[PDB]
Amino acid sequence: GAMDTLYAILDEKKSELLQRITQEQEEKLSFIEALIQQYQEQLDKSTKLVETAIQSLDEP
Amino acid sequence: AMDTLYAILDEKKSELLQRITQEQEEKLSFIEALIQQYQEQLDKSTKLVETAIQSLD
Amino acid sequence: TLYAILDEKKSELLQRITQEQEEKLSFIEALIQQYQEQLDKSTKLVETAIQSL
Amino acid sequence: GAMDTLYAILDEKKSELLQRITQEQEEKLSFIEALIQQYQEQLDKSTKLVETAIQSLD
């Protein structure tokens, strides 16, 4: 009947919505991971610069 | 009747869509837990760095 | 009077070592300030970026 | 020799002035060294903190 069709459609819509939300969340996750990596690298570079400058100051 | 036949078919289609929806929910649940964990790690890190910054003042 | 001579030299030596160490302190202070500024910039950037999500 | 004496007194005086100047130089220099050492220690504590932040992001 028409009511069975309607519910099947709503279930399909539910799966499609989950799919859309998932893709957007996956994008969110990737951006977060690329952000953490860049931050980490910035923090690492700066600290290595600093520890090298001090180590070399008290020397050469 | 095409009714009883189409009914059994619809049951199996429905089961398959349920299986797919279940898997989708699992995967989305995992992505979201990961996003929260990374955000918390990022938060802790910025706090540690701000402590570092202030300790140089 | 000989110790006056030796104390003049010591004073001149103290003066040069002092300028060298002042320079050292100057470099350290600037290095530290530079570190702080970079740490801070990186941190503000990441938080801003997070906020834009 | 009135002029000799004046020089002698002045001779004593410069030595005394010198000893005060030297003592002050050492006090300034020692202070500068403490300040350097203090800063180097803060910077070390600071870098380990950033290292812990970096390790957190793993």
Numbering used by the authors:
A (entry chain A): -3 to -1, 214 to 270
B (entry chain C): -2 to -1, 214 to 268
C (entry chain D): 214 to 266
D (entry chain B): -3 to -1, 214 to 268
What does the original paper state about this entry?
To gain an insight into the assembly of the CC-prone segment identified, we elucidated the crystal structure of the corresponding fragment from human MuRF1 (MuRF1CC) to 2.1 Å resolution. The resulting exposure of hydrophobic residues at the C-terminus permits the formation of an interchain hydrophobic core that supports the assembly of the inverted tetramer. Other than that core, the contacts within each dimer are few, with only two salt bridges (K224-E236’ and E236-K238’) providing chain recognition (analysis of chain interfaces used PISA). One additional salt bridge (K238-D268’’; chains DA in figure 3a) is present in the structure, but it contributes to tetramer stabilization.
MuRF1 targets components of the contractile sarcoskeleton; namely, myosin, troponin-T and titin.
